[PDB]
Structure 1
Amino acid sequence: LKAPVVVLGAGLASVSFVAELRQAGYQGLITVVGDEAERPYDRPPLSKDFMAHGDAEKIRLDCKRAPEVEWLLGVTAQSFDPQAHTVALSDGRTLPYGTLVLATGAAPRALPTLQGATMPVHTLRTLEDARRIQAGLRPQSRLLIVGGGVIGLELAATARTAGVHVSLVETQPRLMSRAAPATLADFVARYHAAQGVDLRFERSVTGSVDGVVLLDDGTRIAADMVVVGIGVLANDALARAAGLACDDGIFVDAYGRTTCPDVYALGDVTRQRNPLSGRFERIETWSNAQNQGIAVARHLVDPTAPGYAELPWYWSDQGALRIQVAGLASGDEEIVRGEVSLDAPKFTLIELQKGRIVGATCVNNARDFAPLRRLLAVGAKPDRAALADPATDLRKLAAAV
């Protein structure tokens, strides 16, 4: 930890990191360069309460635990020179650094087939995006969402609640193929269908003409707006240019170190080890952004602290469904607690591998989620009959381990 500290990006990972630096006791210079001209804010509301209620002052991140930080908002870092230990900014200034931290996140992947479209096509990542989408979210309007992932489905639910007609195109035979159990994805598809979402599976957009979207099955979908949610690509251009190991994401170890001395990275821009799979993955969860940012900061201030070690988890709020998912999407067995029904949805899934809990899902069952994460963390191997048994208290079972 060499002063001064410069952080590129002013999202959740950046804020979490700088607050932890200060809290851990680092009092040297911290300068944060953020390309959006926005007080740092949290993104999940953009698909939900913000999209619905429009108040950005309800979604700002609290920078209170990060005192004495200079935030350069509306400035783009253009390059860094890792030999000179400098960063070049879009406003013509240069920042020196002792330690450079890349927290530049990811940007929505564009749909190559809609590139030259002449109807509204938006992605949903920023406050600017949400405002632009929002300004077209009139009741009875026709929305086409491309991509049946977390963001697409969160938007789908919000749009339906607002009285917008929603069609959604997904290339896979299922929703949420990236980070959800099949059982969950099947249920989620049935829920959205029942709420009036027109789901199109195993279909791709081949292009568009005068407000009509064309599909690979040779059919059409007329829409007033297309929102594309087909994933993100890491904002790793500065790292690539400077010679760091990257591949749609900057490779880091559990200390957040890149392959370049004195340059660290954290959050959505990183490819890191998933301790459950033991594979490198871009982990794009809110919890990763916060906890990885905190872990890297903690270890920079105190080298005796452990590396980042948290197991991955996320939530997704989709209308009546409060979904929570931890760990791996599958194992050799799934245990279902509760019935899976559109009538007052409430259930839990537990994924096991060779008797060990490797994943869990809760739908409208937050009570169960925290104990399951504890069981997951220690690689617990509880009685599978007990795990299935409705009489079992998971919080009690977790404590017993």
Structure 2
Amino acid sequence: EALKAPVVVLGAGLASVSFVAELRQAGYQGLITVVGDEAERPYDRPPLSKDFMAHGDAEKIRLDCKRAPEVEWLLGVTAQSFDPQAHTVALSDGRTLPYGTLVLATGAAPRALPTLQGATMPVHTLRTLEDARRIQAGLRPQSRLLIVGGGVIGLELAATARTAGVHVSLVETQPRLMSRAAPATLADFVARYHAAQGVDLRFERSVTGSVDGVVLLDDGTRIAADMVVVGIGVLANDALARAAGLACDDGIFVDAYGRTTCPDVYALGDVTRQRNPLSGRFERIETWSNAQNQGIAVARHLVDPTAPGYAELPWYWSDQGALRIQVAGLASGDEEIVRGEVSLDAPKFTLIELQKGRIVGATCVNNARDFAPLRRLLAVGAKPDRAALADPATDLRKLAAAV
């Protein structure tokens, strides 16, 4: 009933690929056309601040579109508008696509830093393969890089650059790193780690401008750099939705079925503002797992309306040099349990966040084995013995089973 052919998807990132693969796997055999503005074989973004940045082979980062047969991918073309009454999309190449169902999977773009508008030195953001190539082409040993923003992508780049012999400074307006989505205990540890690897961290500082290759700060000081990479967050690519009259606020509002306020128009991935089931609040979730899992859930329910809505709880990972970080659920509750020592010597530890005895979040550093059982405990809102949670004798995989 809701799934009317033909299907058109705007954007050819992970959310789009995941969605169209699930349509096909679920048994939808009608037309699917995907419009992607980048002239690139669909690819995954996490490598761009990690192994790609370090090794440079794009053929290792392409998405597998095998599970999406009989899809026409229009690469290198921009959707300029859609008409939700006429059920058409206008493309940059002069063509128009009809749709029965339109899916907005247009992701998000890095925020620009207003104070570096009109800079006369290299200032880049890191979102695309083209961006990664441009940054890498300036990543010369003994170069000086300034990163603005202490989010995970900036820190991943910082680690990659330090490994490459680049001098790295980093300016963060907040008193801590990773202020968006990380427990304070983790953020404090991560700052200690980056400082130990030679990153020059500047907290509670903002950029006020730049002159002749030097960046100015609001403490009245200067940082010289060969290159600036801005990583102060992203803004949803929701321009077509806004123009067409959908409800948007730095992100397209969707329910758990991916429905927008416009009939026959859905949205998924980084472009969406959606319910976080742990907080009960709407948020723009900016994670790989959301893009994949939301795409799959929305596709499944389109093909099979008896399927449940999207219900997965949020999580991400970050690879920052020697730290393999995994974070699930909420950054804080009324209680944190620490498993292991938090030490720069062979870092390995787990954090558990509880709210009235209930697990609401978890972090693992170099401890992948414990993250899977903790996510299962989180998912059912488990209330385990806090003594056992702390006790390292406890096997978390066993708790997961017991529940």
User: What's the offset of the Cα at 1:303?
Assistant: 0.3
Q: Distance in 1 between matches of 2:298 and 2:48?
A: 27
Unpaired runs of at least 5, structure 1: none
Q: Distance in 2 between matches of 1:219 and 1:162?
A: 27
User: What's the offset of the Cα at 1:249?
Assistant: 0.0
User: What's the offset of the Cα at 1:112?
Assistant: 0.3
**Equivalence for 2:150:** 148
Q: Distance in 1 between matches of 2:392 and 2:54?
A: 37
Q: Distance in 2 between matches of 1:263 and 1:168?
A: 41
Say which SS state the counterpart of residue 341 (structure 2) adopts.
coil
User: What's the offset of the Cα at 1:387?
Assistant: 0.2
**Equivalence for 2:207:** 205
Q: Distance in 2 between matches of 1:48 and 1:387?
A: 32
Q: Distance in 1 between matches of 2:167 and 2:23?
A: 46
CA deviation map 1:222-275 (0-9, x unaligned): 000000000000000000000000000000000000000000000000000000
User: What's the offset of the Cα at 1:15?
Assistant: 0.3
Q: Distance in 2 between matches of 1:238 and 1:368?
A: 42
Say which SS state the counterpart of residue 186 (structure 1) adopts.
helix
**Equivalence for 2:9:** 7
CA deviation map 1:63-98 (0-9, x unaligned): 000000000000000000000000000000000000
Q: Does residue 290 of structure 2 align to residue 268 of structure 1?
A: no
**Equivalence for 1:321:** 323
Say which SS state the counterpart of residue 246 (structure 2) adopts.
coil
Q: Distance in 2 between matches of 1:244 and 1:390?
A: 51
User: What's the offset of the Cα at 1:327?
Assistant: 0.1
Q: Distance in 2 between matches of 1:400 and 1:62?
A: 36
Q: Distance in 2 between matches of 1:29 and 1:188?
A: 47
User: What's the offset of the Cα at 1:133?
Assistant: 0.2
User: What's the offset of the Cα at 1:397?
Assistant: 1.0
Q: Distance in 1 between matches of 2:238 and 2:392?
A: 47
Q: Distance in 2 between matches of 1:52 and 1:158?
A: 6
Q: Distance in 1 between matches of 2:212 and 2:78?
A: 35
Q: Distance in 1 between matches of 2:34 and 2:165?
A: 40
User: What's the offset of the Cα at 1:48?
Assistant: 1.0
Structure-to-structure mapping, 1:182-261, within 5 angstroms: 182-261=184-263
| Aligned partner of 2:23 among 18, 21, 24 | 21
**Equivalence for 1:306:** 308
Q: Distance in 2 between matches of 1:268 and 1:58?
A: 23
**Equivalence for 1:131:** 133
Q: Distance in 1 between matches of 2:162 and 2:21?
A: 38
Q: Distance in 1 between matches of 2:74 and 2:178?
A: 36
**Equivalence for 1:291:** 293
Say which SS state the counterpart of residue 290 (structure 2) adopts.
helix
CA deviation map 1:19-65 (0-9, x unaligned): 00000000100000000000000000000111111100000000000
Say which SS state the counterpart of residue 337 (structure 2) adopts.
strand
CA deviation map 1:351-400 (0-9, x unaligned): 00000000000000000000000000000000000000010000011111
Q: Distance in 2 between matches of 1:254 and 1:133?
A: 37
CA deviation map 1:272-319 (0-9, x unaligned): 000000000000100000000000000000000000000000000000
Say which SS state the counterpart of residue 214 (structure 1) adopts.
strand
CA deviation map 1:119-144 (0-9, x unaligned): 00000000000000000001100000
| Aligned partner of 1:336 among 312, 335, 338 | 338
User: What CA RMSD, in Å, does the superposition of the two structures yield over aligned residues?
Assistant: 0.3
Say which SS state the counterpart of residue 367 (structure 1) adopts.
helix
Q: Distance in 2 between matches of 1:104 and 1:150?
A: 22
Q: Distance in 2 between matches of 1:100 and 1:338?
A: 49
Q: Distance in 1 between matches of 2:225 and 2:17?
A: 38
Q: Distance in 2 between matches of 1:290 and 1:110?
A: 26
Q: Does residue 71 of structure 2 align to residue 65 of structure 1?
A: no
**Equivalence for 1:162:** 164
Q: Distance in 1 between matches of 2:50 and 2:142?
A: 18
Q: Distance in 2 between matches of 1:18 and 1:135?
A: 34
Q: Distance in 2 between matches of 1:299 and 1:11?
A: 20
Say which SS state the counterpart of residue 130 (structure 2) adopts.
helix
Say which SS state the counterpart of residue 240 (structure 1) adopts.
helix
Q: Distance in 2 between matches of 1:60 and 1:41?
A: 4
Say which SS state the counterpart of residue 294 (structure 2) adopts.
helix
Q: Distance in 1 between matches of 2:151 and 2:251?
A: 20
Q: Distance in 1 between matches of 2:274 and 2:329?
A: 15
Q: Distance in 2 between matches of 1:52 and 1:324?
A: 21
Q: Extract structure 1 runs of 4+ deviating beyond 6 A.
A: none
Identical-residue share of aligned pairs (%): 100
Q: Distance in 1 between matches of 2:195 and 2:226?
A: 20
Q: Distance in 1 between matches of 2:60 and 2:392?
A: 39
Say which SS state the counterpart of residue 128 (structure 1) adopts.
helix
CA deviation map 1:133-178 (0-9, x unaligned): 0000011000000000010000000000000000000000000000
Q: Distance in 1 between matches of 2:94 and 2:152?
A: 38
Q: Distance in 2 between matches of 1:60 and 1:159?
A: 23
TM-score of the superposed pair, with normalisation by structure 2: 0.99
TM-score of the superposed pair, with normalisation by structure 1: 1.00
| Aligned partner of 1:84 among 82, 86, 89 | 86
Q: Distance in 2 between matches of 1:234 and 1:278?
A: 21
Say which SS state the counterpart of residue 120 (structure 2) adopts.
coil
Q: Distance in 1 between matches of 2:371 and 2:51?
A: 23
